[PDB]
Amino acid sequence: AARGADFDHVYSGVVNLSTENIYSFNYTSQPDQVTAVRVYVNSSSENLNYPVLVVVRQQKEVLSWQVPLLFQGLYQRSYNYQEVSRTLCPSEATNETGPLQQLIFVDVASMAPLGAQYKLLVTKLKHFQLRTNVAFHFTASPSQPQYFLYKFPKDVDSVIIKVVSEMAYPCSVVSVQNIMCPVYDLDHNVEFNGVYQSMTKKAAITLQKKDFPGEQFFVVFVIKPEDYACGGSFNLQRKKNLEVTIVPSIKESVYVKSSLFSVFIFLSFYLGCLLVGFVHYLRIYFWNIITIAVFYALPVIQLVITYQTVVNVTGNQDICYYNFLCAHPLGVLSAFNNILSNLGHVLLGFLFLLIVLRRDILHRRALEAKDIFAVEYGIPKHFGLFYAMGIALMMEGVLSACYHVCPNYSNFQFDTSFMYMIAGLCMLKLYQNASAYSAYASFAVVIMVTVLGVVFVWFWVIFSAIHVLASLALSTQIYMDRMVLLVVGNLVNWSFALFGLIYRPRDFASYMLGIFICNLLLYLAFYIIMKLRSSEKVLPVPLFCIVATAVMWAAALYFFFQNLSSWEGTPAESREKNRECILLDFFDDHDIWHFLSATALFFSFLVLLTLDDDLDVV
Amino acid sequence: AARGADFDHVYSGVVNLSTENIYSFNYTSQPDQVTAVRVYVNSSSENLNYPVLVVVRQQKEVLSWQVPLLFQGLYQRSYNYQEVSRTLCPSEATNETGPLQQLIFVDVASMAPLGAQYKLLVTKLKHFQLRTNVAFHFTASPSQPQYFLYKFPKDVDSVIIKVVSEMAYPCSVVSVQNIMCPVYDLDHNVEFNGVYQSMTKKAAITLQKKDFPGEQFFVVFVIKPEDYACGGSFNLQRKKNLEVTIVPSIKESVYVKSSLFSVFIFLSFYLGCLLVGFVHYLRIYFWNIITIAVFYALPVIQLVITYQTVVNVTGNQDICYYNFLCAHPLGVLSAFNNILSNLGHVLLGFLFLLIVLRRDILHRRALEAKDIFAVEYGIPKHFGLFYAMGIALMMEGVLSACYHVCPNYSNFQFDTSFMYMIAGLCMLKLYQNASAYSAYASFAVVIMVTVLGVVFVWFWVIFSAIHVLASLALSTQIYMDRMVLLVVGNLVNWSFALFGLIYRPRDFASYMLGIFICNLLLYLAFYIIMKLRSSEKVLPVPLFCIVATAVMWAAALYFFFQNLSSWEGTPAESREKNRECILLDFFDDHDIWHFLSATALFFSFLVLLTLDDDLDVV
């Protein structure tokens, strides 16, 4: 019992308590290509107490739905849609089997005393297979989910899928499943299997060839009914216009050609320092700091790899905050362009403990043999702080090379934490004890207290008075021309504190921008303009070094001020600010800061070291 | 078109490509009680290429399934079941509406050239509603999931649901949903809504009355096909015999009657000390430790409340490791019997800084006025360690009262961490500097290194030699009778290290059991048997105190040696060892250790303080 209907035609009729509508669609497959049937069903109006029930029977599948669809959300609201569409599964073919005959049965029924109205349209899909470097243009809906198929090529072993929306809204979920057919297109079971990502404007998924049996996969797009998870708020139709692009990945030569550059650019400094040095006349407090440094590192190297294993096991790519367009994977690590750029700290913090140790050896030898108290400058024994300076670079580099494996909220902002100490020591600038030893750990304690309290009684307005008092206390000791300069510096610090209180950009995230002014104040106390009535204190090598650290600090602020990701306000809003890669397709735009910060801090420390000349001969 | 069949009868027949089987069941509801229809369908044999498809149509629901069910699991295995059963949703009634007429349509069809065989049985449910303090006896299966209904009483505002299996296997999931009917009984969508727990032998769920609209809820039981998540391994039938019990919760009077006891039991010590004291003759290193103590606490009080909020938001009760039969909730906190028992540390660490400060004041006054160098015992100025002893109790109590909000793996075992320092100081026992200051932080560094390295090259065998060397080094300084005692102690320590290496009970969890021997060695060096040829050094008050700290250390080891939970080997195996509550239905069996450890450590420290008598008059 059937009617023998034909494909691509609009059918209408009346259903009742006894009348049932039967349709039978017969089609022949091919020994190649993929076909995909699609059923669209529309209801006229009303029907909120006696809906229409449609069942579709295949050889190895039965599907069923009611036409007046009713969703449900938070805060006791009810949405109702009146249009249903579905994409039936394919059957596939082989080269050893001929053409296949297939039958689809569609039954429509209702349970109403008077009747209902329905419209049926069953059509084949012409464009079902995505190709390499070809962009599509479809349109989704919260009651019309979509899926497509992709086949791996013979040479490509990895693919990046890029999905781009247009306006802002509504949110969606994208999934990557393997080639079977208990296919999951409903919203409540879309997260059961496969890599899935929430997206509101952008999405990027990285896939490999060795993890898929048969080298074919399904990309599934589903639209969220209520945009609550993405951070926003909130009947007739929603609609969405997406765009999907598949691109290949880089080869293996780039992984060598970039690491060779990033390990052959920091030996020219060694060669230069050697050349400059060997041309002359044509020729236990530290011990009690390692035990504290090995206390504040082991929770990081017990939490980070655990989080990485959790992300690499459960499937959810919503726990870490990477840059999803420039995250190259290697091995267990999923970001191998933010762990090889931190190799500058632990290699440029080793030229201090080859020069200042030689200077210590030479000065102690000169004290042992010659009379070092003749024509000297104010107790020449001055070291012991350079050894606690040139090891904080390594203890900042090792601590920075463990945060970029999973940026999250538990790890907080523990990357620019010891840099506050490295820029706020300001002890060796008081050259030529009681209030310094106590304030050494107290400075880092106050910095950590401010960092913790920045997130949580008018913190912005309360900090201006404390900053002004601290600036006045510092300028009282540092400092009439000197009094006028101290007053101008205190006024500038108060104006900067008032401007920061007026701004209040990103609360705890703005702690870096608020302590950059403190670092500038600490690094603007260069007294090189003392030559009004004093000695010369100027030489070509410190003049070149102060020119270099004046020039090379301007460039290192631009890449700081370009924001790429964000650790606040949902994990689906980081993807909007994502950017691509420059400089040989390996380095990011928040990865040329770890190359300039180290080589500016090293030159500033060298300026601090090599200064106070033209007095050893007096 | 129908046949007019009757309830509770076995029907059989043959289906084909053209023949379809229709059944129509008409039933009348009642103005009270709950009915529940249940459909059982059985297939004879074979049918792996042409299955049987069954659809059930109601007024506001359509359900559909194939009879030769096929599941799927990891490692490319395929299971097939031949029996299906389902429980249809109820329709419910009101007191303002009369009896309701309902019709169920059951259609059976196939797509086979020869035929298939099927058996249908549709029956009503007699026992559908659970009652208070009544235990049921049902039987589940991985292809037969179950659900029941419960209604809140008029006085009870909270309920504990206890589910108990029998043997070990197989695992299951239990869910608590609200009263609607898009009911979720399949395995892939059971975790969409509601509180759910994985269970293999035991489960306990706590529910409240203010969170459920209408005061009715659904308890859903579903059996897992593959027992992989619970930790185990791995066709005809599985089967499971459960048991469910609903019990009420305690009143509000217990929350007052226990806190009054647990704050009125620790003032009798104050009254006793006052009475003993006022009866006589009828009458800056510490400053540099607060800055380090406020460094190792803020990640805990940024991670713990975040984890608690995550558990209290997402629904998953599988991230923290509580005792699910003795976890009383109050407010945001879900365990208010492990945060009010840690109030003993921060209240019994305050009787030292009222007695030793008075002794310091009296001794300084006596030095200022009288000649304190007459008839004294070896430089009577001895304090400065009691002030670093009586504040580690508070810095262990505050650090212990933040781990019991969510025991997990990231928090590790950071509860008995400063107790290693508190028991391994052993500095003031060398009475009457160079190697002590260096070894102070080094002892805690070695303890933290051992704790970290215990989890991860024959650690058990390598530690015996290090322990023997450390024991020999300690006994060389501490210590012929003294040499024989030192040799016997070194031999006993080597035997204990060999026994611990032979045992190796729980690796990193066994670090507490392996350092308990070290604590016993440090607290067994009491030289009170020096009276062979020496002075008396014995008085009634230190004799009573050494008797008390000898007696009250035996009882505090039993409750340690009773294990209640475990932080390793899946989060569904902690529930097997769970126990109930003793001592006025509030305190646990791992909560009478925080009351005896403090009052034994305080008496041991008092023994250390008050000793060396009978020499102030000589």
Residue numbers in the entry:
A (entry chain A), B (entry chain B): 42 to 275, 286 to 334, 443 to 591, 598 to 621, 626 to 648, 681 to 819
From the publication, what sentences describe this entry?
Here, we use single particle cryo-electron microscopy (cryo-EM) to determine the structure of heterologously expressed full-length hSIDT1 at ~3.4 Å. As ChUP family members contain CRAC motifs, and are believed to be a cholesterol transporter, we excluded cholesterol and its analogues from our purification buffer to obtain the structure of an apo-hSIDT1. We used HEK293S GnTI− cells for protein expression, excluded CHS during solubilization, and purified the protein in digitonin for final sample vitrification at a sample blotting temperature of 18°C. As a result, our sample is apo hSIDT1 that lacks complex N-glycosylation and is vitrified at higher temperature and pH. hSIDT1 is a dimer where the protomers are related to each other by a 2-fold (C2) rotational symmetry, with the axis of rotation being perpendicular to the plane of the lipid bilayer. Each protomer has an N-terminal β-sheet rich ECD (yellow box) and a C-terminal all α-helical TMD, which can be divided into two parts – the TMD core (blue box) and the lipid binding domain (LBD; gray box). The β-strand-rich ECD adopts a double jelly roll conformation, and two such double jelly rolls, one from each protomer, are juxtaposed in a C2 symmetry to form a dimer. TMs 1–4, along with TMs 10 & 11, form the TMD core of the protein, and TMs 5–9 form the lipid binding domain (LBD). The TMD core is stabilized by four tiers of evolutionarily conserved interactions – the TMD-ECD interface, the TMD disulfides, a metal ion binding site, and a phenylalanine highway. While we observe density coordinated by H563, D574, H791, and H795 in our structure, due to a lack of convincing biochemical evidence, we have not modeled a metal ion at this site in the structure. In SIDT1, we notice a similar phenylalanine highway within the pouch formed by TM1, TM3, TM10, and TM11.
SID1 (systemic RNA interference-defective protein 1) is a transmembrane protein involved in the inter-cellular transport of small non-coding RNA that cause systemic RNAi. In humans, there are two known systemic RNAi defective transmembrane proteins (SIDTs) - hSIDT1 and hSIDT2 – that are implicated in hepatocellular lipid homeostasis, glucose tolerance, insulin secretion, tumor development, cancer chemoresistance, RNA translocation and degradation during autophagy, and activation of innate immunity. The transporter classification database categorizes SIDTs as α-type channels (TCDB: 1.A.79), belonging to the cholesterol uptake (ChUP) or dsRNA uptake family of transmembrane proteins whose function and stability are regulated by cholesterol. The emerging consensus on the function is that SIDTs are cholesterol-dependent dsRNA transporters with a divalent metal ion dependent lipase activity within the transmembrane region.
